[PDB]
TrEMBL record, chains A, B:
The modification Cysteine sulfenic acid (-SOH) is found at residue 100. Pfam families: DJ-1_PfpI. It comes from Pseudomonas fluorescens (strain ATCC BAA-477 / NRRL B-23932 / Pf-5). Coiled coil: none annotated. GO terms for biological process: regulation of DNA-templated transcription. The gene is inhA. InterPro entries: Class_I_gatase-like, DJ-1/PfpI, INH-QAR. Residues 4-163 form the DJ-1/PfpI domain. Signal peptide: none annotated. This is Isonitrile hydratase InhA.
Length: 226, 226
């Protein structure tokens, strides 16, 4: 059975995780894990309560690891236990993946050094200090690393992983069973297509978080430099 | 504060719920509820464990009610307590909404009689016996009723509700903050675009469920006829 694991941490952006989880859990001969320091309740940034199913120590070797983003990424970038777990699993995983600011966690773990990668538009400047080659594209592949932008990035890349783990017909069947054919009613999902006034509002609202994450990123980079 | 409620039931398709939940919870001056017979754990069809936050009796009057779909819809179509709750809230709600097979629950509650509506493609034949005018479109509005197809229908219609509860700039800001710009890697999300061989596989896999739901639908229709 293919072993797929998601890191589930306090203040996760739950949709980053729950989207790909429901797609991948629809496949035959998969087992999906929600991983934290111990099994039990973990609260997402919205207040939604989720349950982790396994600890770091008990998690099986994973074929796919996925790091979601969220407010809680800042703490995870300086959590040595979590970073060590991610490094251990990434060494043998067939696919190392992240959604949105989850790639900053991969960066803090040292897994983006010399690699092409993306992250959420408001935090994109933090990739270069973590050793990455920053790329402004929605899904960026480099070897076995996939990084994606947007809260639903993992839904789309989960279909790619289904096609490569199984075959294209299986991915198409899952897409049809879920009737997945999005059609957003607005076109403001990128800073290049949203109105300038909306981009300004969004940037202002992210400014305090960006400032705090600049500080965290520099400390994380210092650890990689040692 | 705008009061938004999702029905959370055993064997729900969790993404039907968790998608719109994370979008709507991003708005100012909203409160989001996860409603079941009592607060506590509810298991989705994938095994993901979610927590209901309020009971039917304690739920405040809702401005928006949303019924997700999933395997568990069949039981809900014959749950008199749940159907009565939905009818009570729908009487005063500004928006009555559903995702995928959640519209079959609205149908069983009597709320689609004479109304245009859609549902999941494999179960679309069950709308007419529940009194609906079946429509093959992804989002169907009739008055204050919105029904949508696809596992992520609620993400898209949540942006429409944001624009109508607040304004277009607020909806655009949420879209940009979430960097929401989907781009599926396959085009098999409708029976009209998927390969015929894939449609056959999907229809065969749904056949037992459709048969069982034909029986449930006829009993639900008999109750409406009384
Ligand atoms: Cl997206
Ligand atoms: Cl969809």
């Amino acid at each position: 059975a293919v072993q797929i694991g998601f890191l589930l941490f306090p203040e996760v952006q739950q949709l980053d995780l729950t989207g790909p989880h429901d797609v991948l859990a629809s496949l035959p001969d998969v087992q999906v894990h929600l991983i934290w320091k111990e099994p039990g309740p973990v609260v997402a940034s919205s207040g939604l309560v989720l349950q982790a199913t396994t600890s770091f120590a008990d998690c099986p070797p994973l074929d796919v690891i996925c790091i979601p983003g969220g407010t809680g990424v800042g703490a995870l970038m300086e959590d040595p236990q979590a970073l060590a777990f991610i490094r251990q699993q990434a060494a043998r995983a067939r696919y190392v993946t992240s959604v949105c600011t989850g790639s900053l966690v991969l960066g803090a773990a040292g897994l983006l050094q010399g690699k092409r990668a993306t992250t959420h538009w408001a935090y994109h400047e933090l990739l270069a200090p973590l050793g990455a080659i920053p790329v402004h594209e929605r899904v960026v592949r480099d070897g076995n690393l996939l990084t994606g932008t947007g809260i639903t990035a993992g839904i789309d890349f989960a279909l790619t992983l289904a096609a490569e783990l199984f075959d294209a017909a299986t991915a198409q069947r899952v897409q049809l069973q879920l009737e997945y054919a999005p059609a957003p009613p607005f076109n403001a999902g990128s800073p290049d297509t949203a109105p300038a006034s909306v981009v300004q509002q969004a940037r202002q609202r992210a400014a305090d978080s960006l400032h705090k994450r600049r500080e965290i990123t520099l400390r994380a980079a210092a650890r990689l430099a040692a």
